[PDB]
Design an enzyme around this catalytic site. Structure first.
Site, PDB file in Angstrom:
ATOM      1  CD  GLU A 238     -62.233  -4.520  -9.342  1.00 50.53           C
ATOM      2  OE1 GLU A 238     -62.312  -4.646 -10.498  1.00 50.53           O
ATOM      3  OE2 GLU A 238     -62.377  -3.164  -8.949  1.00 50.53           O
ATOM      4  NE  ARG A 391     -64.840  -7.885 -16.526  1.00 51.72           N
ATOM      5  CZ  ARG A 391     -63.455  -7.175 -16.045  1.00 51.72           C
ATOM      6  NH1 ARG A 391     -62.552  -7.952 -16.114  1.00 51.72           N
ATOM      7  NH2 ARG A 391     -63.612  -5.954 -15.718  1.00 51.72           N
ATOM      8  CD  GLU A 420     -64.475  -0.132 -21.065  1.00 52.82           C
ATOM      9  OE1 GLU A 420     -64.448   0.864 -21.572  1.00 52.82           O
ATOM     10  OE2 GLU A 420     -64.314  -0.633 -19.823  1.00 52.82           O
TER      11      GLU A 420
END
Lengths: 436, 436
Positions: A238, A391, A420
């Site tokens: 994003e 990431r 997670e």
């Protein structure tokens, strides 16, 4: 600008040529460099014609070895914008990174920064290679030789990836999650994103890892860089901030996560869970509301809008609830004012953000540095493109690491949150190539 | 006394319960109040059953719709002690504040005060709430319902803080440092602590700020009050005076400062700098010698001692060299004699003290008032506990301010002294919450 190639050579995806050109030109000559992928176009920026180093206690502008030292005070954005405008010469694009810690100034937390904490490093390149599906261009014809030679000689065959154990918890993520839930219960903040580092106990091949990782990811931006003693690569899920030439300001809060990439069936069940889960919905809406409050500082209020409200966005090993928040930059505001208002991303920090950032300074391994900052491209026409640095993998001062986090709220449980981070680490951990 | 809870429900730290109760009870009913934290116990004292007002031109006892007036001259301590004993009924604790200007009398500097300068405000409360990690007691049963309800309702979330600009210097602190160092060079005195106010351009939420600040400090005492026309909160780094029931007199000179709270590595560097720096060592040593000379006026000579000599004491945004000086109160001396001998704290005034106080009256904004004075608790057994009022915020007569200072010696530079004030402001400025 010189055309090198019409179309791509057979067996070159753009990412593969970009990554191969990184290994064969800048890595070979010891040049600094940065690859930035945006909307099907890879820019490989080679060599530092000039560079800016912004630290907590000074500013340096470097031109082919020659160092200007400067002071700065007040807000780091204003110093950086000046220095960027200087090294761009009004004509060259500028690339680099901004550290998490750049964001402390907004919340009056810069007293928590150690002397000499890096805030940003950017450079204007000697040359740019531009790779699309339509072909390959280069700003300077003296590079045509080496580009053609790597094209014709062809594509390195990426080795099998190495293995990294994600299961150990040396930094006690599970316990730190517990400190955070108690602070939330105490009323100190509503939400914080906390992370854990995973040390890669070997040296990495960054160009190859970049190429393999990119085949297994669908990011909004990707990057590979060697700059400021740091190597890094990443699949940014994003934008933290984009400013377009026409004055449009964009931010993309992604908040709410389930696993992805486990087959059509499992991925659909996870998706249906995500979209109907009340906790994820609430935290997503809250994030979007916060984004809107931030962007409203720098855009005309009649201009602000949400597009693709709370849609599922697939990101390799994970899928997320995502929204796009936008507006029209106000009179007397700059691209850097936009970035400062939105930085660091609410979705990688917490709510309220001042207490979230405070908590991260205390409860995360410090500094975060590049992690949860931005990789940036600034253009002479007033453009700014800032990918949220997640990431991603890092190499600096003899350490190589991965880093992933999760949003902690009152009801969070240590074991779910640790799992997670494992899902998110699956964007990188599987595709890591040993430096051999 | 009446127990409310034998154990707090989770998500109730004592400071958060204390702050919440201030908002929920005295702030709702316009009561005078004072919270004082000492050794893991918070006392919330509510409502003025009886009061003493000590001004430069006289003393008033206020109770039962009467005021009795008393004249005093020369030294205010005897009149204050006499008045405190009066409103105590031999059974109530007394709380309040003593202003910097109280300390002028010992040095015949009171002629520089404005007529009617307030010197002290103390009160015996209508009720006391005592809070520890292990439970809540209250002195009056008619409070139990209110307290029980708030506890059950849950502690409110801390609102987001506001931004205060620490960079400007409207009081010309940099210039005043230069005046001081020229005075020192000429031989007028050795050292003075000069300060700067920072005006807060909005009404503050004192209970919420108190809570947020407490989470980010490690003080010897903390307080929150609304008393005598003033609101104040703070995280006192040291006692100016304590007298224990057994007659032990204690003072804690802290002198010599570096940044703290910037991660272990930077904090260790800064610590190693502080403990090895000859300027800081000499000034610390000199402070301890002065403290010993003051305390010798009121304690037995064979009882005086220094404990934890020149140890590093961590105080949130800063760390300090500190020592503890003690002795046994002499026959014929009272707790007030001890306070007067030690007031104002040598480490917040100068060397020699007479010249230092005089230099503050001429070269600092006047009056200092509560700043560098004390917040006090006086107990009917003859106890006194006077926290030095630093690292605090203040509101009075439509103005709200912070205030921080630095020790100036002949070689001090304005840039470094200004930066020191910023470091100490780092304790409080980022946690200031706007009252909406």
């Amino acid at each position: 600008w010189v055309s090198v190639q019409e179309g791509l050579p057979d067996g070159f995806a753009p990412a593969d040529l970009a990554g191969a050109l990184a290994q064969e030109i800048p890595e070979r000559h010891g040049d600094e460099y940065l690859i930035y992928e945006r909307d099907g176009e890879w820019v490989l920026a080679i060599g530092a014609r000039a560079s800016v180093e912004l630290d907590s206690d000074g500013l340096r502008i470097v031109r082919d070895g020659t160092i200007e030292k400067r002071d700065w005070s007040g807000h780091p954005g204003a110093a950086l914008e000046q220095a960027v405008n200087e090294i761009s010469d009004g004509t060259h694009r500028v690339f680099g990174w901004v550290a998490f810690e750049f964001g402390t100034y907004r919340f009056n937390l810069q007293h928590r920064l150690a002397p000499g904490t890096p805030l940003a490093r950017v450079f204007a390149p000697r040359a740019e290679v531009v790779i699309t599906a339509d072909g390959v261009s280069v700003s300077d014809e003296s590079y045509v030789e080496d580009i053609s030679r790597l094209i014709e000689q062809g594509v390195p065959a990426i080795p099998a990836p190495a293995s990294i154990d994600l299961a150990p918890d040396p930094s006690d993520y599970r316990g730190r999650v517990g400190i955070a839930t108690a602070e939330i219960r105490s009323g100190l903040y509503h939400k914080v994103i906390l992370s854990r580092r995973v040390e890669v106990p070997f040296a990495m091949d960054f160009p190859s890892t970049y190429r393999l990782g990119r085949h297994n990811n669908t990011p909004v931006r990707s990057f590979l860089l060697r700059l400021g003693g740091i190597r890094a690569l990443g699949y940014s899920p994003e934008l933290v901030t984009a400013v377009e030439a026409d004055g449009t300001v964009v931010t993309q809060p992604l908040a709410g996560t389930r696993a992805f990439g486990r087959g059509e069936d499992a991925d659909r069940v996870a998706r249906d869970d995500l979209e109907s889960n009340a906790k994820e919905i609430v935290e997503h809406a809250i994030s979007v509301r916060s984004s809107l409050a931030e962007i409203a500082e720098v855009v005309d209020p009649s201009s602000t809008k949400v597009t693709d409200f709370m849609t599922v966005r697939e990101r390799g090993s994970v899928q997320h609830l995502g929204s796009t928040v936008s507006g029209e930059l106000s009179a007397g505001m700059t691209r850097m004012d936009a970035l400062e208002a939105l930085f660091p991303a609410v979705t990688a920090s917490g709510i309220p953000k001042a207490e979230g950032v405070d908590a991260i300074l205390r409860l995360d391994d410090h500094p975060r540095g590049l992690y949860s900052g931005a990789v940036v491209m600034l253009s002479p026409n007033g453009g700014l493109d800032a990918a949220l640095t997640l990431r991603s993998a890092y190499e600096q001062d003899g350490h190589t690491w991965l880093r992933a986090g999760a949003g902690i709220i009152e009801a969070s449980t240590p074991e779910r949150e640790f799992e997670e981070t494992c899902e998110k680490l699956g964007s990188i951990a599987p595709y890591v190539i040993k430096r051999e």
